[PDB]
Design a protein around this ligand. Structure first.
Ligand SMILES: *[C@@H]1O[C@H](CO)[C@@H](O[C@@H]2O[C@H](CO)[C@@H](O)[C@H](O)[C@H]2NC(C)=O)[C@H](O)[C@H]1NC(C)=O
Ligand SMILES: *[C@@H]1O[C@H](CO)[C@@H](O[C@@H]2O[C@H](CO)[C@@H](O)[C@H](O)[C@H]2NC(C)=O)[C@H](O)[C@H]1NC(C)=O
Ligand SMILES: *[C@@H]1O[C@H](CO)[C@@H](O[C@@H]2O[C@H](CO)[C@@H](O)[C@H](O)[C@H]2NC(C)=O)[C@H](O)[C@H]1NC(C)=O
Ligand SMILES: *[C@@H]1O[C@H](CO)[C@@H](O[C@@H]2O[C@H](CO)[C@@H](O)[C@H](O)[C@H]2NC(C)=O)[C@H](O)[C@H]1NC(C)=O
Lengths: 84, 98, 50
């Protein structure tokens, strides 16, 4: 100490992690509805179908290619686990 | 169109107002409430074919099946005019007879 | 002479402190702008679909 000090931050790691977990749960199990009013229970498959319909691809593609999409997502998360 | 840019929730319009050294905006917002519960299904099987909704989602209170919009509840009788067929439902998960 | 030396040290240290404060202000403004952009992005395409 030579006349200077470092003030501790108001927010700690624990509450930040809790907020991130809350946002993740809201964006997985509810969708985008909880960002406006109150959260809703919607299965993940229909949220995927709506997100695909948003960009221009008919929802039939998702329901006819569920297993391949799941495997591709698992491989992607597995490789991004080691990428960094 | 972007969510939570101006106003909270779905946005409708805005009004500007002057200030001594700034501007004041009044956003009109749309917010739903009074939720309910329902039993849903992703696809409908009929005569060995798969039927999908043109726009909306399938709902059922326990005895009958209806199609409604995403943000409001106005059930309508399911017909061939608001659905389209694509292949046969053998690999679709969650099919229900109707 | 002691007061002259003390005044020289005082003005030098004051100049150094002013330079440090200015640099800190510039960096703080830049970080604030970057974090505002990050918050806008998070509120845009983490809650819904862009
Ligand atoms: C839809 O169903 C859910 C599941 O039962 C209801 O949530 C429960 O509501 C009761 C009534 O207040 C609570 O005592 C339970 O604790 C709730 N369960 C959970 C897991 O939170 C929900 O209320 C139903 N929707 C409506 C409009 O009644
Ligand atoms: C589910 O909703 C349907 C549609 O309203 C109900 O079917 C009708 O129910 C009324 C009684 O509320 C009867 O008078 C009608 O004859 C029924 N059929 C039609 C075509 O209108 C059905 O009863 C509801 N089921 C449950 C469990 O609530
Ligand atoms: C939705 O979840 C329920 C609960 O896990 C599933 O019911 C299970 O179905 C499998 C076979 O389909 C059975 O082996 C389990 O015993 C059932 N669970 C219970 C608690 O009875 C249901 O299949 C799921 N629906 C879909 C479409 O996946
Ligand atoms: C939905 O309808 C199909 C078509 O009839 C049913 O599949 C038949 O079910 C009967 C009785 O269980 C069997 O004897 C037949 O072999 C089945 N196949 C065919 C081609 O007729 C099916 O059981 C019904 N229910 C569900 C949940 O799919």
């Amino acid at each position: 100490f030579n006349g200077l000090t470092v003030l501790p931050p108001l927010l700690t790691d624990e509450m930040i992690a809790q907020y991130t977990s809350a946002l993740l749960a809201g964006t997985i199990t509810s969708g985008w509805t909880f960002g406006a009013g109150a959260a809703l229970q919607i299965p993940f498959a229909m949220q995927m179908a709506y997100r695909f319909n948003g960009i221009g691809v008919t929802q039939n593609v998702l329901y006819e290619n569920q297993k391949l999409i799941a495997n591709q997502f698992n491989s992607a998360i597995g490789k991004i686990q080691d990428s960094l | 169109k972007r969510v939570d840019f101006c106003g909270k929730g779905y946005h409708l319009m805005s009004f500007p107002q002057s200030a001594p050294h700034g501007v004041v905006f009044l956003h009109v917002t749309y917010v739903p409430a009074q939720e309910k519960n329902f039993t849903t299904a992703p696809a409908i099987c009929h005569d060995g074919k798969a039927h999908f909704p043109r726009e909306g989602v399938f709902v059922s209170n326990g005895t009958h099946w209806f199609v409604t919009q995403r943000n409001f509840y106005e059930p309508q009788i399911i017909t061939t005019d608001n659905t389209f067929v694509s292949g046969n439902c053998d690999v679709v998960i969650g099919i229900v007879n109707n | 002479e002691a007061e002259v030396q003390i005044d020289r040290l005082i003005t030098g240290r004051l100049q150094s402190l002013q330079t440090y404060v200015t640099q800190q202000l510039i960096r703080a403004a830049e970080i604030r702008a970057s974090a505002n952009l990050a918050a806008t992005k998070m509120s845009e395409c983490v809650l819904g679909q862009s």
